[PDB]
Amino acid sequence: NAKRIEGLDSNVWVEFTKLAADPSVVNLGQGFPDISPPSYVKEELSKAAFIDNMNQYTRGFGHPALVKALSCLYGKIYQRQIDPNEEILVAVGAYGSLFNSIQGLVDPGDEVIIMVPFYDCYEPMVRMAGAVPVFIPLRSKPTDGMKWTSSDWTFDPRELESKFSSKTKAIILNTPHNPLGKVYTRQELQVIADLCVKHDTLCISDEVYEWLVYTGHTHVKIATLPGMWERTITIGSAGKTFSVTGWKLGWSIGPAHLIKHLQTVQQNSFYTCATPLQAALAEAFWIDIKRMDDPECYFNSLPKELEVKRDRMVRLLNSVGLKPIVPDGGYFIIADVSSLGADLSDMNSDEPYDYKFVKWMTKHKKLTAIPVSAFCDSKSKPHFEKLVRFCFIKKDSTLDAAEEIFRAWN
Amino acid sequence: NAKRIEGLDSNVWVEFTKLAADPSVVNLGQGFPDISPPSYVKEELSKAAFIDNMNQYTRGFGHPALVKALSCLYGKIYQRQIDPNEEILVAVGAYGSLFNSIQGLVDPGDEVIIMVPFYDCYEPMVRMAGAVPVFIPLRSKPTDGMKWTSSDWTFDPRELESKFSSKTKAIILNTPHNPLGKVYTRQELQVIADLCVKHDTLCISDEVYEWLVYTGHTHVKIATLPGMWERTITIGSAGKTFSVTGWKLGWSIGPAHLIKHLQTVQQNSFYTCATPLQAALAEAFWIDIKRMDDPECYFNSLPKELEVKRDRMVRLLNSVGLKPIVPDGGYFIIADVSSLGADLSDMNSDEPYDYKFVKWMTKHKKLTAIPVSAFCDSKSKPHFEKLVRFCFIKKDSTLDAAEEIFRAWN
Ligand SMILES: Cc1ncc(COP(=O)(O)O)c(CN)c1O
Ligand SMILES: Cc1ncc(COP(=O)(O)O)c(CN)c1O
Ligand SMILES: NC(=O)CC[C@H](N)C(=O)O
Ligand SMILES: NC(=O)CC[C@H](N)C(=O)O
Numbered sequence: 001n002a003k004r005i006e007g008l009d010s011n012v013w014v015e016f017t018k019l020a021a022d023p024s025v026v027n028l029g030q031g032f033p034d035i036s037p038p039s040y041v042k043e044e045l046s047k048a049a050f051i052d053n054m055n056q057y058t059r060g061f062g063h064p065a066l067v068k069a070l071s072c073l074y075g076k077i078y079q080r081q082i083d084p085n086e087e088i089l090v091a092v093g094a095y096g097s098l099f100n101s102i103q104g105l106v107d108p109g110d111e112v113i114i115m116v117p118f119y120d121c122y123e124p125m126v127r128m129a130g131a132v133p134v135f136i137p138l139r140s141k142p143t144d145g146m147k148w149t150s151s152d153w154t155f156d157p158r159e160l161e162s163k164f165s166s167k168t169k170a171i172i173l174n175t176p177h178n179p180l181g182k183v184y185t186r187q188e189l190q191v192i193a194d195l196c197v198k199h200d201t202l203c204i205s206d207e208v209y210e211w212l213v214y215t216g217h218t219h220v221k222i223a224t225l226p227g228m229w230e231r232t233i234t235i236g237s238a239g240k241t242f243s244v245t246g247w248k249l250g251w252s253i254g255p256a257h258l259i260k261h262l263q264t265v266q267q268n269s270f271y272t273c274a275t276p277l278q279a280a281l282a283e284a285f286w287i288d289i290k291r292m293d294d295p296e297c298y299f300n301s302l303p304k305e306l307e308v309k310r311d312r313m314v315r316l317l318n319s320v321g322l323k324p325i326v327p328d329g330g331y332f333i334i335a336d337v338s339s340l341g342a343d344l345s346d347m348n349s350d351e352p353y354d355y356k357f358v359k360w361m362t363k364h365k366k367l368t369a370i371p372v373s374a375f376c377d378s379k380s381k382p383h384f385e386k387l388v389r390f391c392f393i394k395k396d397s398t399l400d401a402a403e404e405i406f407r408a409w410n
Numbered sequence: 411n412a413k414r415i416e417g418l419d420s421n422v423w424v425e426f427t428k429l430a431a432d433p434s435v436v437n438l439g440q441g442f443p444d445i446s447p448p449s450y451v452k453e454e455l456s457k458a459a460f461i462d463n464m465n466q467y468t469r470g471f472g473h474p475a476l477v478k479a480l481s482c483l484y485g486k487i488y489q490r491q492i493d494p495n496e497e498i499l500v501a502v503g504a505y506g507s508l509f510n511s512i513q514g515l516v517d518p519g520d521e522v523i524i525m526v527p528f529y530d531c532y533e534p535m536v537r538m539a540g541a542v543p544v545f546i547p548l549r550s551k552p553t554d555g556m557k558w559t560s561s562d563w564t565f566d567p568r569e570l571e572s573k574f575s576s577k578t579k580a581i582i583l584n585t586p587h588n589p590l591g592k593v594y595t596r597q598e599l600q601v602i603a604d605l606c607v608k609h610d611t612l613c614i615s616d617e618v619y620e621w622l623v624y625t626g627h628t629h630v631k632i633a634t635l636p637g638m639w640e641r642t643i644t645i646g647s648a649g650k651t652f653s654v655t656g657w658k659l660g661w662s663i664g665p666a667h668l669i670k671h672l673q674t675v676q677q678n679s680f681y682t683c684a685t686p687l688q689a690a691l692a693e694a695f696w697i698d699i700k701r702m703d704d705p706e707c708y709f710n711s712l713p714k715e716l717e718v719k720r721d722r723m724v725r726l727l728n729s730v731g732l733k734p735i736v737p738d739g740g741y742f743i744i745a746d747v748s749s750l751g752a753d754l755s756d757m758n759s760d761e762p763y764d765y766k767f768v769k770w771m772t773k774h775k776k777l778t779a780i781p782v783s784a785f786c787d788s789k790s791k792p793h794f795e796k797l798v799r800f801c802f803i804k805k806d807s808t809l810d811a812a813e814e815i816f817r818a819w820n
Contacts, residue, residue, distance in 0.1 A: 005671065008674055008678055009673075013470065125678060246465045270505050274659075
């Protein structure tokens with residue numbers, strides 16, 4: 001192995017393969033939608049398949065009709081003109097966008113601030129770049145009494161500030177947050193923005209779940225706050241927006257002077273993304289862009305549908321004594337499992353509690369989930385290891401099977 | 411920009427975004443097939459599109475049906491049992507496979523040997539890894555007097571040996587060769603094998619054009635030579651194999667102890683490739699794998715169809731005083747351009763001779779092509795700068811438009 005990848009060969013997802021290959025297990029762990037994607041998304045891909053040209057090379061930095069649809073949709077959200085060619089880069093998922101961003105912008109010995117828990121890829125991407133991840137946790141605060149929510153988690157602005165130094169190149173922001181479901185507030189973003197401007201750092205903002213925010217909350221884009229446009233890369237994903245995780249297309253949106261460096265990594269790595277997927281996606285966008293104010297727009301109908309499933313899930317977790325944290329956004333929910341005081345007596349590894357719990361739940365109850373300590377750096381693990389993450393982008397019948405397990409639990 | 415991409419922002423193909431544009435020009439430049447993909451390749455993509463699961467995330471290192479198909483096909487070629495999970499990585503094109511190999515295997519300060527002319531991405535990919543490209547040119551031999559062919563180019567084994575030191579990490583091999591169409595001989599591969607074994611170096615073998623070898627030549631895989639399986643990564647491409655360049659799926663095949671490091675790059679960069687493309691590509695493979703014996707197999711029928719088109723191009727180029735180098739393989743043909751009359755003081759730009767010629771032929775003859783100096787490091791360019799490359803993976807009607815241009819040349 002090359003030095004840049006020393007110790008980066010472990011991967012939580014490669015780790016979690018085994019859990020649910022067993023067909024009789026209900027899998028609420030990985031973010032695999034088993035709802036149907038919209039009919040027209042599948043239709044448009046079939047249509048593109050039969051056009052010879054759409055099966056040949058397209059523009060390296062993104063299919064022209066696609067980046068054009070992206071600049072239209074995001075121009076409305078940002079309330080500014082987005083340049084399709086210079087301010088957008090289409091990459092292989094939000095992963096590939098994150099990869100372009102760190103690879104083109106982050107040097108060895110640079111510091112990168114990461115909020116804990118974090119989508120697991122952030123830490124190894126920062127390391128393969130020779131950079132130093134700097135961790136800060138989200139801490140709970142007292143609850144309103146009736147409900148535990150994502151909004152009861154936040155950061156200490158004084159603690160955040162202390163993480164910023166002359167070596168900080170960037171901070172990574174994930175809102176709506178995976179695994180917590182947190183929708184960052186304008187006040188939180190403002191504290192983040194103040195510091196990035198004051199230290200002259202970048203913000204890389206992972207916003208794949210941007211459409212999935214629930215009543216009481218709103219997606220705010222940090223790159224729309226004063227001084228932030230010039231210093232933010234904001235990332236979206238086809239998989240999340242159209243429920244086609246398997247298309248693996250995302251985009252980075254930001255200023256031309258930053259996006260050019262992302263574009264230089266891409267030209268020198270995989271170069272271009274698939275033409276047929278990008279062609280179909282452009283069409284899907286236009287179909288929904290043109291009804292953005294209608295309920296039937298997929299940007300509106302999916303979170304509306306997911307809010308119902310979310311609520312059903314919180315009731316299911318409650319019925320067995322799991323303390324759910326009701327998410328403001330996204331399609332994951334965390335439950336504290338410690339009030340079950342489960343029977344993990346003879347799992348004798350040095351794994352965190354949540355991993356043992358999940359292995360135990362899979363074997364005994366036939367239900368899998370993801371340990372939140374998978375989204376934590378070594379020192380943070382003991383502070384989050386009683387927490388397990390459940391996925392609810394699932395068809396009713398799947399959540400029915402889940403309900404059968406919760407009803408039979410004792 | 412990050413330091414790692416310093417000076418790597420210029421891209422040959424980004425630059426040629428000049429006169430491919432104008433409507434009336436016959437483009438024989440970029441490797442863009444304008445023939446149809448096989449009908450079943452297209453139908454299989456349409457069918458995967460309508461299966462919901464084929465739109466969601468698949469195995470990270472390659473869709474299981476696709477790695478199994480590639481296992482079975484390549485295991486016949488190699489006469490060995492290839493492990494589909496450990497000895498194969500599906501990536502985003504041959505580009506992505508090349509990136510995985512260099513990123514996962516090559517350190518700052520390593521030397522990487524590259525044979526000139528080289529497919530252009532080799533050099534910046536080695537520079538991005540902090541390594542030193544060590545150039546050796548292919549050189550001409552006396553012809554049989556009758557015709558000029560790719561096999562009249564070779565390398566000096568003694569000069570190659572002198573490129574190997576204790577800093578050498580690897581040699582990049584490209585057979586059949588782009589741009590010049592060379593199908594490296596068993597005796598050439600043996601000289602490279604002897605030196606990788608003696609120095610304990612890697613060979614990264616880029617064999618995207620492996621099926622496209624014409625009469626009197628045989629694709630031989632260096633990884634099949636004694637002692638080479640354990641030091642070789644061999645790369646393939648869907649875009650070349652099934653004439654669907656826009657699908658951006660390639661693969662690396664080789665021993666587990668090397669493939670795992672490519673796997674580590676990929677899990678940390680883009681992770682997963684697209685599911686519907688991989689599903690459809692697995693089915694396109696099973697179809698052709700079952701009929702390898704038969705002339706109807708795409709592995710057989712395409713090289714046959716293209717050989718006719720190569721022979722046509724060589725007649726058309728001869729017709730106008732461009733001396734073609736007849737390719738053993740691939741879908742590019744170089745023509746020597748020096749026996750024509752120049753223009754070219756209307757430029758004076760002292761950029762290479764071939765770049766001036768290609769601008770002159772675009773403007774005045776309405777035909778584009780690629781200057782060979784684009785595939786050459788700085789010191790080599792004077793040895794190759796009268797050479798121009800043409801693509802013939804084109805429909806009959808495109809080649810007729812080309813015919814009409816040659817007919818009207820004088
Ligand atoms: C926060 C976050 N970022 C990025 C991704 C990956 O995005 P993509 O599938 O487009 O590569 C995910 C989905 N696993 C995610 O939850
Ligand atoms: C020799 C060679 N290797 C790799 C590639 C790129 O392969 P892909 O399109 O699958 O990424 C090309 C482009 N045709 C090539 O000519
Ligand atoms: N590698 C994957 O597909 C994992 C993604 C899934 N959304 C997760 O966060 O759990
Ligand atoms: N998209 C591309 O860069 C096409 C490259 C093509 N194979 C060529 O060599 O001309």
